[PDB]
RNA sequence: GCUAAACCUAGCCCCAAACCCCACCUUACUACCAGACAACCUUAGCCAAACCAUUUACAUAAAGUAUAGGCGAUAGAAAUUGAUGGCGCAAUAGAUAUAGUACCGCAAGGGAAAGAUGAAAAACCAAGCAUAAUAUAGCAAGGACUA
RNA sequence: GCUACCUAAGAACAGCUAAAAGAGCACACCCGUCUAUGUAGCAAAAUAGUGGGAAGAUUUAUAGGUAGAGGCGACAAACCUA
RNA sequence: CCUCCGCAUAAGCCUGCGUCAGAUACUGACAAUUAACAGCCCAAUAUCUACAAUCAACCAACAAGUCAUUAUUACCCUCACUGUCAACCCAACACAGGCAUGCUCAUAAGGAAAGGUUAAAAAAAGUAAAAGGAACUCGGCAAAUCUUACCCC
């Protein structure tokens, strides 16, 4: 009889309560006998770096110069990454300079994005 | 003797007044549209 | 108790603001301007009752005829119902017949 | 809270003139004002005192807030609210003179005044409850004035009462002082 | 609030009369 | 509420002043005071 | 990670890796008596117990022996001035049992005014003998 | 270790804990991808510690020492995420020209409203997906009347807003 | 904030503010003339002169500015008196409390002439934007740490370790950390 | 002297002008499996005809004319002609609206109420009663009367 | 989601007499004969007693179906959210 | 002193007598229910599957019945997610009503009919009653007993 309360797995008969989740991404599948097969590749692997020797504390000293915000753009990235090599080889096949015709064949395809975060 | 005609059961609730059932037929689609036009906070049940 | 216990804030009316000062100007535009413009052309208001007058039924009929296609759906439904009711009232009810 | 309360006085007297060397404080006062006169102060202090008490008589809180400090005004007015005080300074026996002076920066000057005054305090109902309207009484007192150092001024800050002060005039009405309101279990000692 | 001034003015006069009657001046 | 009555207080008082010396609610309630006052006049 | 589309895995595909984790957790003092090796966390609702295990073992190098989770229902009974129910958010609670016999106990965290105090000390409460007469006047 | 979930023991109980300034987006833009990756976990550990402090302060019914540093950490993490997102977006635009990381399309739903349907990942083609085919991406003729009604409701709301704004402006001008 | 929230002396999120303006209040909105951000000329710390009311003529220092109500609070000026800490028994202590003043009631003061002045936001080639007094010219100036264990040093914060490249953070970190992945991501269908 | 009384602006009405991250059709708001299933079809009736049955409306001028019509109730052309705000509401009003919320209903759906200080809070009047219960007799008043 | 009927797959029926029973007595359970109370009630049809059935054409939980120019009906013009 | 009950599962509800602080089984804050129980399943193509249940043994049936695989091909490499609280649900209510199942068959579990007084009428429930025993009444209704025979449908 309650319509304004959110629909959660805590409401409904046993089948409903079992079937609905809470947003947790699936980790595997179910086989005969309701046995859960967990796939390792489906478990997110936290790629935590080595923080030893890292010099960047969470906060920044207040005695730090203030600089104008310059959001990175495609043009800026091209100028700072590709333009030098392009100029050199023009003075002296874009794959050599860096362009990749197709995202297929890459582990990290930019579009459609296939990596987390 | 009367008064307790509502014997709650979420299965019947959702199978009778649910979003899927309302969208199943054009009449229910228009019901949802009427609720949306009126501004109801609860379009379906 | 339906009477206020304090004097209302004084209402100051500027009798010589621009609107009042120039009110009525160009009402004789016709007779004093070779009848190039009729005074009714000085009337700013709804398109369907510029230089025109009538009872409620006539006004509703004119509104539907002139801007009916541009009216909102529920406003037009209300206008149709109002025209129906006014027709019935004026043509079937009243002391005189 | 970027804004903070801007006090116009201090909590209490810096150094109490224990009644029956301060030229440094006088130097500070002069370096802040450049037109102050210790020798001329007592007359001004007496005028301030008389005016403040007349303001108490007339219930002139606006003038009181100019003639006395914020640590003084409540002390003068709290218990006199809802009663009429008929105060009047009749004469000053001996000339008032500065006694002690000490010093965002405030300077306090203690002035000893041995004058003669009158009191008559009435209830809400106009019933006399203290003093006589006409009989003058000799009062020796030590008024501590204070000042704040741009638009500040000299205002009565406190009155130091000597421990050896003679007992004040007795009250007209008798009083009852209840004993320990013992609970049933408790016994009187 | 009812728009208007004259009824309010009349009621103010009546209130003044009642005030005078309750606390007649010396 | 284009036009609203603002004098109803005084209209009521014109009748109640003559009923102030009656008994019961006839001296307070206009619906009753008016009838009694008309009868009195 | 949360609020992000997980790249769909097909058989034989690469391992799913998250580089900038989006899960932020809280270590909370248990409300009831717990075993010495148990730690209580409040977790984002989208985090599995496997995710919590890897999170703790990778970011904090905490040897985790067992993990259990439960979804605590936040109260929806409270109502505002408009009689509309205020929903206390639901949250996931994780109980983590440390490995290698390690033990954990929640630390004991949390182990003008001058003028006001001076005036209060200088209150000089009214004397009953004075019978309500003001004390300022010296007469 | 679990000690990383709590502030320094010396800081425990301190009324105020002094903290630096939150990382700025411009400052972060100078840092390498690896440096940002490490700083993300530094800030994550700090954020976990501060959230733990907040919850424990609520439990103890005491104010959280220096609550502003939690906001500083959240701002720093948001700035880092924005910088990484900017770099990823620039690279995606350069290599593919797409301005959105997730495929999608403008589609008319069953209610006649134009929505940006965000594609989901499936293993079978759409023409074979049963659930997708159940989902309807077209509005039948009976929805046109409700589309008009919603349009007129929006127009009425907008007209009321604008007329009220003009009334208020005129009142202000008369007052001043 | 709730619509038509009445800005007061207390900040919009204090305990006193919540007490005075609970969520259900519907007081009449305060009419404030719409001074544009580019026309506001009173700033915290500015020396001003009071034109109306008690303490008229006296010059003080602006302590607070409630822009949402065209208010400037002159420190220690335009003061009434209120009791703080008044309990059931103690009368409390009298304190001078300032009352807010309108910018129309308050005028800036020349830095040297020490007199009220009318101001203009005249641009200057060097000082692109700055206040200039009209009756007498002259520009009125606009008035106005040890790193902890968790604060980056300035040099470390400003170090430019970023070498722009056509690599995502994910693959760059994979190379840096040595993670080797040979499996090819099988193509999926989007719809 | 208590209940209370008031209050002015929240907004609204009529016109003009102008065209307007993630999740979610499965049990919606649910990351991740072979579909196949697809829309179009005269409005009716009330009511009027004093019943009812054919029938009954959905710029100006020509013109309520030609025509239609149980030739009656009524219906009704065309050619042709030329075509900048408020003597608005002001909290029982004006939108239902503080909100399509609360609440009510299984659902479609129905659908409310109300607020008022001040520059700053970092400062006398409805009914009903009480003051003050009541004295033979009576539409409760009127003529009166010293009463 | 009540109710009329139906569909799928479930459940309940002590004890005694008899013997494979639309059998008898009689719990649970279903119903509601008669009386009293209640009648703004505990209840928009109840309570107490009394009573009919209680291995069957029985009772009942769950999900589904039939929709008003209709449905369903061991026809009472029954019942289809008081 | 009562025990209709009670404890669990299901269904339903959704934090709804846990701690603290304020008020005057309320308000605010804090905490909590941890999977083994239960839900959430199954790779294809063909191909199998006459013989109830009832202690299944006699018998006895009719209303003719809930329970089964093989052949080949694929395939292990990896214990997630969700319910878990309560004095509770449908009846506008802390409603004498409705409410499936397993055990307890009177309980080890769960509860309190009396706010205090007096003991008037009338009223309700109950108990007892001289002699009589339906003379009451429309009628043996009710109560008390356990009780024959004849008729309509
Ligand atoms: N009749 C009427 N005039 C209006 C309305 N709204 C605006 N106006 C008139 O529009 C004119 C211009 O309005 P302004 O607000 O001064 O200027 P603006 O924003 O350029 O005006 P618009 O282009 O009409 O939006 C004035 O004559 C207004 O009185 C309205 O609702 N009705
Ligand atoms: Mg049922
Ligand atoms: Mg008719
Ligand atoms: Mg008629
Ligand atoms: Mg024509
Ligand atoms: Mg209204
Ligand atoms: Mg009265
Ligand atoms: Mg049996
Ligand atoms: Mg039988
Ligand atoms: Mg029959
Ligand atoms: Mg019949
Ligand atoms: Mg669990
Ligand atoms: Mg009891
Ligand atoms: Mg009693
Ligand atoms: Mg007898
Ligand atoms: Mg007889
Ligand atoms: Mg006999
Ligand atoms: Mg007889
Ligand atoms: Mg009998």
With contact defined as beta carbons under 8 Å apart, do D150 and D3 qualify? no
Separation of CA C80 from chain center: 19
CB neighbour burial string for I102-124, b if at least 16 within 10 angstroms, e if fewer: ebebbbbbbeeeeebbebeeeee
Please state, in angstroms and rounded to a whole number, the distance separating the CA atoms of residues D76 and G134.
8
The boundaries of the domain holding residue G8 are 1-139
DSSP, residue by residue, G53-70: HHHHHHHS---EEEEEEE
**Gap between the terminal Cα atoms of chain D:** 53
With contact defined as beta carbons under 8 Å apart, do D146 and D154 qualify? yes
What would the two tokens of residue I47 be?
């020396």
Separation of CA D181 from chain center: 36
Residue that the structure tokens 């906060």 belong to: A59
Q: Are strands I151-152 and A59-60 parallel, antiparallel or unpaired?
A: parallel
CA-CA-CA-CA torsion for H125, H126, H128, H129, nearest 10 degrees? 110
Please state, in angstroms and rounded to a whole number, the distance separating the CA atoms of residues I97 and I106.
18
Q: How many structural domains does chain G have?
A: 1
- Gap from I133 CA to J49 C1', Å: 88
Looking at residue D14, the DSSP 8-state letter turns out to be: S
Beta partners for residue G69, in sequence order:
G94
Please state, in angstroms and rounded to a whole number, the distance separating the CA atoms of residues A73 and G109.
46
Please state, in angstroms and rounded to a whole number, the distance separating the CA atoms of residues I17 and I10.
6
Q: Closest CB to H5: pick one of G8, G27, G110.
A: G27
Nearest Cα residue to D85 out of D55, D114, D64, D113: D55
Please state, in angstroms and rounded to a whole number, the distance separating the CA atoms of residues F13 and F20.
10
Beta partners for residue D155, in sequence order:
D146
Please state, in angstroms and rounded to a whole number, the distance separating the CA atoms of residues I180 and I60.
70
Ligand 1 pocket: which of H155, H156, H166 to mutate (most atoms within 8 A of CB): H166
Helix (H, G, I), strand (E, B) or coil at A71: coil
**Gap between the terminal Cα atoms of chain A:** 40
Nucleotide nearest to A15 (CA to C1'): L39
| Helix (H) or strand (E) run with residue A29 in it | strand A28-30
Q: How many structural domains does chain C have?
A: 1
Residue G85's alpha-carbon distances to A10, B19, D47, H146, in angstroms, are 18, 23, 67, 31
Sketch the domain layout of chain I as residue ranges: 1-144
Class level of CATH domain B3-45: mainly alpha
Residue F4 exposed, middle or buried by CB count within 10 Å (0-12, 13-18, 19+) = exposed
Q: Are strands I131-133 and I93-98 parallel, antiparallel or unpaired?
A: unpaired
Distance B1 CA to ligand 13 centre (A): 29
Nearest Cα residue to F24 out of F15, F36, F40: F36
With contact defined as beta carbons under 8 Å apart, do H80 and H40 qualify? yes
CB neighbour burial string for I145-177, b if at least 16 within 10 angstroms, e if fewer: eebeebbbbeebbebeebebbbbbbbbbbbebe
Please state, in angstroms and rounded to a whole number, the distance separating the CA atoms of residues D134 and D118.
6
Nearest CA owner, ligand 1 atom 8: H166
Please state, in angstroms and rounded to a whole number, the distance separating the CA atoms of residues G139 and D140.
9
- Gap from G83 CA to K47 C1', Å: 39
Question: Residue G122 is part of a domain; what is its CATH number?
Answer: 3.30.70.330
Please state, in angstroms and rounded to a whole number, the distance separating the CA atoms of residues G76 and A11.
14
Please state, in angstroms and rounded to a whole number, the distance separating the CA atoms of residues I77 and G43.
53
Please state, in angstroms and rounded to a whole number, the distance separating the CA atoms of residues H166 and G116.
52
Mutate to test the interface with I, among A61, A62, A97 (most CBs of I within 10 A): A61
Q: How many CB atoms lie within 10 A of CB D16?
A: 14
Method by which the coordinates were obtained: cryo-EM
Residue C38 exposed, middle or buried by CB count within 10 Å (0-12, 13-18, 19+) = exposed
Tell me the angle at which helices G49-59 and H33-60 cross, rounded to the nearest 10 degrees.
110
Helix (H, G, I), strand (E, B) or coil at H35: helix
Looking at residue D132, the DSSP 8-state letter turns out to be: -
Q: What is the largest CA-CA distance in chain B?
A: 39
What would the two tokens of residue A19 be?
């079937």
Please state, in angstroms and rounded to a whole number, the distance separating the CA atoms of residues A69 and H86.
13
Beta partners for residue D115, in sequence order:
D92, D139
Q: Are G109 and H48 an interchain contact pair (Cβ–Cβ within 8 Å)?
A: no
- Phi and psi of H173, rounded to 5°? -60, -45
Tell me how many degrees the CA angle I156-I162-I163 measures, rounded to the nearest 5.
140
Nearest Cα residue to H55 out of G32, G2, G22, G31: G31
Beta partners for residue I64, in sequence order:
I73
What would the two tokens of residue C34 be?
């070779």
Which chains are within 8 Å of G by 3+ CB pairs?
A, D, H, I
- Phi and psi of I95, rounded to 5°? -135, 140
Nucleotide nearest to B1 (CA to C1'): K45
Residue A33's alpha-carbon distances to A30, E9, H40, in angstroms, are 8, 90, 43
Q: What is the CA radius of gyration of chain E?
A: 12
Residue that the structure tokens 């439904």 belong to: C77
DSSP, residue by residue, chain I: --TT----SS-TTSHHHHHHS-TT--PPPPP-----TTT----TT-EEEE-SSTTTT-EEEEEEEEGGGTEEEETT-SEEEEEES--SS---EEEEEE--EETTTEEEB-TTT-SB--EE----SSSSS-EEESSS--EE--------TTEE-HHHHH-------S--HHHHHHHHHT----------EE-
Residue D45 exposed, middle or buried by CB count within 10 Å (0-12, 13-18, 19+) = buried
Tell me how many degrees the CA angle A93-A99-A102 measures, rounded to the nearest 5.
100
By C-alpha distance, the chain H residue nearest C12 is H174
Question: Residue D35 is part of a domain; what is its CATH number?
Answer: 3.10.450.240
Q: Are H36 and I169 an interchain contact pair (Cβ–Cβ within 8 Å)?
A: yes
* Helices first, then strands: H and E counts in chain F: 2, 0
CA atoms within 13 A on the CB side of D12: 14
Please state, in angstroms and rounded to a whole number, the distance separating the CA atoms of residues D133 and B21.
95
CA atoms within 13 A on the CB side of C56: 11
Please state, in angstroms and rounded to a whole number, the distance separating the CA atoms of residues D74 and I92.
9
Q: Which residues on A lie below 8 Å from H45 (Cβ)?
A: 58
Q: Are B36 and H140 an interchain contact pair (Cβ–Cβ within 8 Å)?
A: no
With contact defined as beta carbons under 8 Å apart, do D160 and D142 qualify? yes
By C-alpha distance, the chain B residue nearest H141 is B26
- Phi and psi of D52, rounded to 5°? -65, -40
Beta strands in chain D (DSSP E): 84-85, 88-92, 97-102, 106-118, 121-122, 128-130, 137-148, 155-160
Query: Does residue D110 lie within any of the structural domains?
Result: yes
CB neighbour burial string for D104-123, b if at least 16 within 10 angstroms, e if fewer: eebbbbbbbbebebbbbbee
| CB-strand contact G89/L, under 7 Å | no
What is chain I's length? 191
């Amino acid at each position: 009889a309650d319509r304004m309360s959110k629909w959660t797995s805590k409401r409904g008969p046993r089948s409903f309560r079992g079937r609905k989740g809470r947003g947790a991404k699936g980790i595997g599948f179910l086989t005969s006998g309701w046995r859960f097969v967990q796939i390792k590749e489906m478990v997110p692997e936290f790629v935590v770096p080595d923080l030893t020797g890292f010099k960047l504390k969470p906060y920044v000293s207040y005695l730090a110069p203030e600089s104008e915000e310059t959001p990175l753009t495609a043009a800026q990235l091209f100028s700072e990454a590709v333009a030098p090599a392009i100029e050199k080889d023009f003075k002296d096949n874009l794959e050599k300079y860096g362009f990749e015709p197709t995202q297929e064949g890459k582990l990290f395809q930019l579009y459609p994005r296939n990596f987390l975060r | 003797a009367r008064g307790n005609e509502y014997q709650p059961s979420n299965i019947k609730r959702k199978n009778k007044h649910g979003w899927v059932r309302r969208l199943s037929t054009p009449a229910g689609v228009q019901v949802i549209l009427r609720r949306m036009l009126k501004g109801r906070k609860s379009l379906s049940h | 108790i339906g009477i206020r216990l304090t004097l209302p804030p004084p209402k100051v009316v500027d009798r010589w603001n621009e609107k009042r000062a120039m009110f009525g100007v160009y009402d004789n535009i016709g007779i004093l301007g070779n009848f190039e413009k009729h005074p009714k052309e000085l009337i700013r208001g709804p398109i369907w009752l510029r230089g025109w007058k009538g009872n409620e039924l006539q006004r509703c009929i004119r509104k539907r005829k002139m801007v009916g296609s541009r009216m909102f759906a529920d406003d037009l439904h209300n206008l149709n119902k109002r025209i129906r009711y006014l027709y019935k009232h004026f043509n079937r009810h009243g002391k005189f017949r | 809270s970027d804004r903070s309360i801007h006090l116009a006085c201090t909590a209490g007297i810096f150094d109490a003139y224990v009644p029956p060397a301060s030229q440094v404080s006088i130097r500070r006062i002069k370096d802040y004002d450049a037109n102050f006169k210790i020798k001329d102060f007592p007359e001004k202090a007496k005028d301030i005192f008389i005016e403040a008490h007349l303001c108490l008589n007339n219930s002139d809180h606006d003038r009181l807030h100019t003639l006395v400090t914020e640590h003084c005004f409540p002390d003068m007015t709290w218990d006199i609210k809802y009663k009429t005080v008929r105060w009047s300074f009749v004469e000053s026996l001996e000339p008032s003179h500065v006694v002690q002076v000490r010093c965002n920066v405030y300077g306090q000057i203690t002035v000893r005044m041995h004058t003669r005054q009158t009191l008559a305090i009435y209830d809400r109902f106009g019933r006399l409850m203290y003093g006589q309207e006409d009989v003058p009484k000799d009062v020796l007192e030590y008024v501590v004035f204070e000042k704040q150092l741009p638009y500040g001024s000299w205002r009565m800050h406190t009155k130091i009462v000597p421990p050896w002060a003679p007992p004040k005039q007795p009250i007209l009405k008798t009083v009852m002082i209840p004993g320990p309101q013992l609970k049933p279990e408790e016994e009187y000692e | 609030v009812k728009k208007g001034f004259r009824a309010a003015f009349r009621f103010q006069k009546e209130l003044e009369r009642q005030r005078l009657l309750r606390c007649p001046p010396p | 509420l284009r036009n609203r009555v603002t004098d109803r207080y005084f209209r009521i008082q014109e009748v109640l002043k003559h009923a102030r010396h009656f008994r019961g609610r006839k001296n307070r309630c206009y619906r009753l005071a008016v009838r009694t006052v008309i009868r009195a006049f | 990670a949360r609020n992000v589309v997980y790249p769909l895995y097909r058989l034989g595909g690469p391992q799913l890796r998250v580089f900038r984790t989006n899960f932020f957790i809280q270590l909370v003092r248990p409300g009831v008596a717990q075993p010495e090796d148990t730690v209580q966390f409040r977790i984002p609702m989208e985090m599995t117990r496997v995710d919590l295990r890897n999170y703790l073992e990778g970011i904090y190098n905490v040897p985790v022996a067992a993990v259990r989770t439960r979804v605590q229902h936040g109260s929806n009974k409270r109502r505002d001035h408009r009689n509309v129910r205020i929903k206390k958010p639901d949250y996931k609670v994780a109980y983590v049992q440390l490995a290698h016999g390690q033990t954990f106990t929640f630390p004991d965290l949390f182990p003008l005014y001058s003028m006001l105090e001076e005036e209060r000390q200088q209150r000089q409460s009214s004397d009953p003998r004075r019978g309500g007469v003001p004390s300022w006047f010296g007469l | 270790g679990l000690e990383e979930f709590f502030d320094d023991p010396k800081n425990w109980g301190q009324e105020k804990v002094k903290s630096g300034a939150a990382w700025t987006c411009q400052q972060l833009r100078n840092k390498s991808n690896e440096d940002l990756h490490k700083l993300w976990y530094v800030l994550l550990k700090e954020r976990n510690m501060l959230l733990t402090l907040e919850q424990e302060a609520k439990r103890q019914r005491l104010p959280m020492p220096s609550p502003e540093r939690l906001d500083k950490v959240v701002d720093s993490m948001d700035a880092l995420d924005k910088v990484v997102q900017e770099r990823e977006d620039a690279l995606r635009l350069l290599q593919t020209g797409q301005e959105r990381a997730r495929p999608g399309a403008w589609r008319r739903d069953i209610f006649g409203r134009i929505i940006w349907h965000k594609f989901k990942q499936w293993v079978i083609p759409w023409h074979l997906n049963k659930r997708y085919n159940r989902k309807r991406f077209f509005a039948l003729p009976y929805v046109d009347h409700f589309l008009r009604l919603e349009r007129e409701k929006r127009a009425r709301i907008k007209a009321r807003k604008e007329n009220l704004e003009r009334k208020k402006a005129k009142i202000l001008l008369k007052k001043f | 904030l709730p619509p038509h929230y009445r800005y007061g002396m207390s900040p919009p999120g204090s305990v006193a503010d919540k007490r005075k303006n609970p969520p259900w209040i519907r007081r009449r909105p305060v009419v404030v003339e719409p001074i544009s951000d580019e026309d506001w000329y009173l700033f915290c710390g500015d020396t001003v002169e009071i034109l109306e009311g008690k303490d008229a003529g006296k010059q003080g220092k602006v302590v607070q500015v409630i822009r949402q109500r065209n208010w400037v609070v002159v420190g220690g000026l335009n003061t009434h008196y209120r009791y703080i800490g008044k309990t059931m028994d103690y009368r409390g202590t009298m304190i001078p409390s300032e009352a807010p003043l309108l910018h129309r009631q308050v005028k800036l003061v020349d830095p040297m002439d020490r007199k009220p002045t009318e101001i203009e936001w005249r641009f200057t080639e060097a000082g692109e934007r700055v206040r200039v007094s009209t009756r007498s010219g002259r520009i009125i100036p606009k008035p106005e740490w040890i790193d902890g264990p968790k604060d980056t040093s300035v040099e470390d914060a400003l170090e430019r370790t970023y070498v722009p490249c056509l690599k995502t953070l994910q693959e760059e970190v994979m190379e840096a950390m040595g993670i080797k992945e040979t499996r090819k991501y099988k193509k999926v269908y989007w719809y």
